[PDB]
Amino acid sequence: HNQVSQFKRAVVLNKEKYNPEFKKITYDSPVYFNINEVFNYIYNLNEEVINKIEGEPSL
Amino acid sequence: AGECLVVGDSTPIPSIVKLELPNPEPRSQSIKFHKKWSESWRTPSFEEVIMRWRKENG
Cβ(A44)–Cβ(A13) below 8 Å: no
**Method used for this model?**
cryo-EM
> CA torsion, points A28, A32, A35, A39, in degrees to nearest 10?
-80
HSE of B48 in the Cβ direction (CA atoms, 13 Å)?
Answer: 3
Q: What torsion do the CA atoms of B44, B47, B49, B51 make, to the nearest 10 degrees? A: -170
Residues B6-18 as b/e (b if ≥16 CB within 10 A, e otherwise) read eeeeeeeeeeeee
Contact by Cβ (8 Å): A23, B56: yes
Asked if B15 contacts B5 with a C-beta cutoff of 8 angstroms, the reply is: yes
- Among residues B24, B23, B3, the alpha carbon closest in space to that of B15 is found at B3
Contacts of A22 in chain B (CB under 8 A): 54, 57-58
Looking at the complex, report in whole angstroms how far the Cα of residue B54 sits from the nearest Cα belonging to chain A.
9
* Interchain CB distance below 8 Å, A29 and B56: no
* DSSP per-residue letters across B1-58: --EEEE-SSSSSS-EEEEPPPPSSPP------HHHHHTS------TTHHHHHHSSS--
Helix (H, G, I), strand (E, B) or coil at A15: helix
Residues B28/B12, Cβ–Cβ less than 8 Å: no
